[PDB]
Amino acid sequence: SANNPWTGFQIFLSPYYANEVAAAAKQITDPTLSSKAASVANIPTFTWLDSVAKIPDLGTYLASASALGKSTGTKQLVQIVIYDLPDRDCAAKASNGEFSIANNGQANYENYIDQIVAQIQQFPDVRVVAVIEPDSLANLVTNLNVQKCANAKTTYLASVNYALTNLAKVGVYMYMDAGHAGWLGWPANLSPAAQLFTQVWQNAGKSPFIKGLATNVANYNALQAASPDPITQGNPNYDEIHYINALAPLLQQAGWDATFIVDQGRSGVQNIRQQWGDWCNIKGAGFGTRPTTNTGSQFIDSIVWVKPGGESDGTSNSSSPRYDSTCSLPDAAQPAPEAGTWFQAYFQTLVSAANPPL
Ligand SMILES: CO[C@@H]1O[C@H](CO)[C@@H](O[C@@H]2O[C@H](CO)[C@@H](S[C@@H]3O[C@H](CO)[C@@H](O[C@@H]4O[C@H](CO)[C@@H](O)[C@H](O)[C@H]4O)[C@H](O)[C@H]3O)[C@H](O)[C@H]2O)[C@H](O)[C@H]1O
C-alpha cells in the first residue's frame, strides 16, 4: 500500500546474530564458504523477545540504532518478534515459554509488554517493526480440539490484544503471525482465519499500525514455487504467494487493507520435507531470498528473515525436559541442540545450500 514500513529506512543489523555468524564462519574450514558465511552477518534478521530476559537487549538495540542513524544520516528500523504468550505453543509437544495461565500468565504477559513499551517510548527516532506471537492465533483457527489450546483461547486473544493495543501507542508497525500456506492457506481455513484476524484487529481499535500479517515464520515454504512441493497435495495454495493472494481479499472485504511480510530465511531449498507439518531443524534447508521490499506482490511489503537460520528449533535429546519429538523425525537434522542455541552443522548447510547463492 501507500506506507511500506521499510521504505526510506536502514535496518539495524542484529549484533547477536552478527556475533553468532562471525564465530560460526571461523569454524568453517573451507575459506570461500567461510567468507560466504561471514557475509550473513550483514543480512537483517528479526530479534526474538522470547522472554523478559531479552527486554534489556531490546533497549540496547534501540539506543544503538538511534546513534547509528545520527552517525550516518539515516533513519533506522529495529525488527523484533513478540513471543512470550502464557501457555505458549499450545498445540506443541513441548514449549519453552516461561509464563503459564495457571500462574498469573495474563498479568505477567501484560508486564512483559509494558516493559517493551517503556523501552520503545524512549527512542522515538527509531522505527520498530514487530511480528506478533508466532504459533499462537493460527492454533485458534485449526487446533481448538487440542485441550491446551481450547483452555488457552481466551488468554491468547486477551494477551495479543494487549500487545496490539499498547504497542500501537508507541507507533510500532505490527504484523500478526498467520502461519503459512500449509496451515491457514488450505482454502477451507481461509475464511475462519480471516474472521479471527479481523475480530482481533477490531478489538485493538483497527489501529493503522496493525499493518497486517506475517507468514512462513520459522518455516520453509516457497514464496513462489517452480512446481508444487509433494507435501502440498490436496492444497491448491502450495506456496506463500497463493496463500496471501487468497487471504488478502477476505481481509479487505472486512475493511482491513492488510499487507504481509513473508519469512524466507530457510526457504532456499524446496522439497526437503516428508510431511508439510514437519517443522524442526529440517535437514538440507538453505538460506532463501534475502530480505527485500522487491516482493513481486501488491500484498507483500517485504520478504524478511524472521527466524535466524542456524539457531536450533529444538533439541533431539529425548531426555531433555524441553524435548519435542518432532525434532527426532527422519527429516530433522540430528543430533540437534536446545532451541535457540547455535547449531553449527545446520548453519554450514544453510550457507552451502543458499539459493540464491551468497
Ligand atoms: C499445525 O501445527 C502447528 O504447526 C506449526 C508449524 O507450522 C508448529 O510451529 C512450530 O512451533 C514450535 C514451537 O512448538 C516452534 S519452535 C520454537 O522456535 C522459537 C524460534 O526460535 C524458539 O525461541 C527463540 O528463538 C530465538 C531466536 O532463535 C532465540 O533467541 C531463543 O533462544 C529461542 O527460544 C523456541 O524456543 C522454540 O520452541 C517453531 O518455530 C514453529 O515452526 C506448531 O507447533 C504446530 O502446532
Q: Is residue 357 part of a domain?
A: no
Binding residues for substrate: 48, 50, 180, 183, 219, 279, 307, 311
Cβ of 296 below 6 Å from ligand 1:
no
* 132 phi, psi to nearest 5 deg: -100, 110
Q: Is residue 3 part of a domain?
A: no
Q: How far is CA 218 from CA 47, 110, 122, 305, in A?
A: 13, 25, 30, 9
Q: Is residue 2 part of a domain?
A: no
Which of 333, 327, 326, 328 has its CA nearest to residue 353? 333
- Chain-centroid distance of CA 286 in Å reads 17
| Residue 74 near residue 68, CB atoms below 8 Å | yes
Q: Is 89 a catalytic residue?
A: yes
Widest CA span in the chain? 54
Enumerate helices (H) and strands (E) in the chain, giving the number of each. Answer: 9, 8
| Residue 79 near residue 12, CB atoms below 8 Å | yes
Amino acid at 289: T
Q: How far is CA 308 from CA 61, 172, 289, 313, in A?
A: 16, 21, 13, 10
Resolution number, Å:
1.6
Pairing of strands 76-82, 47-49: parallel
Q: Would you state the cell numbers that stand for residue 14, as one nine-digit string? A: 542484529
Q: Is residue 1 part of a domain?
A: no
Q: Is residue 183 part of a domain?
A: yes
| Calpha distance 293→356 (Å, rounded) | 16
Supply the range of the domain harboring residue 303: 10-352
| Residue 282 near residue 331, CB atoms below 8 Å | yes
| Residue 268 near residue 355, CB atoms below 8 Å | yes
Q: Is 264 helix (H, G, I), strand (E, B) or coil?
A: coil
Which of 352, 323, 328 has its CA nearest to residue 40? 352
| Calpha distance 72→120 (Å, rounded) | 21
Amino acid at 122: Q
Amino acid at 238: Y
Q: Would you state the cell numbers that stand for residue 324, as one nine-digit string? A: 519435542
* 66 CA distance to ligand 1 middle (Å): 30
| Residue 203 near residue 161, CB atoms below 8 Å | yes
> What is the C-alpha radius of gyration for the chain, rounded to an integer number of angstroms?
19
Half-sphere exposure of 45 (CA within 13 A, CB side): 25
| Total of domains in the chain | 1
| Calpha distance 17→56 (Å, rounded) | 16
Q: Is residue 358 part of a domain?
A: no
Q: Is residue 166 part of a domain?
A: yes
Cβ of 343 below 6 Å from ligand 1:
no
Q: Whose CA is nearest to atom 24 of ligand 1?
A: 340
Q: What DSSP element (H or E) covers 351? A: helix 344-352
Residue given cell 495474563 in the structure block: 106
Q: How far apart are the first and last CA of the chain?
A: 30
Q: Whose CA is nearest to atom 30 of ligand 1?
A: 340
Q: Is 324 a catalytic residue?
A: no
Q: What share of residues in the chain are helix, strand, coil (percent, to 5)?
A: 40, 10, 50
Q: Is residue 163 part of a domain?
A: yes
Q: Would you state the cell numbers that stand for residue 23, as one nine-digit string? A: 564465530
The single residue of 135, 177, 263, 324 carrying the catalytic annotation is 135
Number of Cβ atoms within 10 Å of the Cβ of 1: 11
CATH of residue 195's domain is 3.20.20.40
Q: Is the dihedral of CA 194, 299, 126, 305 positive or negative?
A: positive
Residue given cell 472485504 in the structure block: 253
Pocket test for ligand 1, best of 93, 311, 341 (most atoms within 8 A of CB): 311
Q: Would you state the cell numbers that stand for residue 50, as one nine-digit string? A: 522470547
Half-sphere exposure of 36 (CA within 13 A, CB side): 20
* 34 CA distance to ligand 1 middle (Å): 28
Number of Cβ atoms within 10 Å of the Cβ of 318: 10
Burial code of 178-200, b = ≥16 C-beta within 10 A, e = fewer?
A: bbbbbbbbbeebbeebbebbbeb
Cis before 15? omega within 30: no
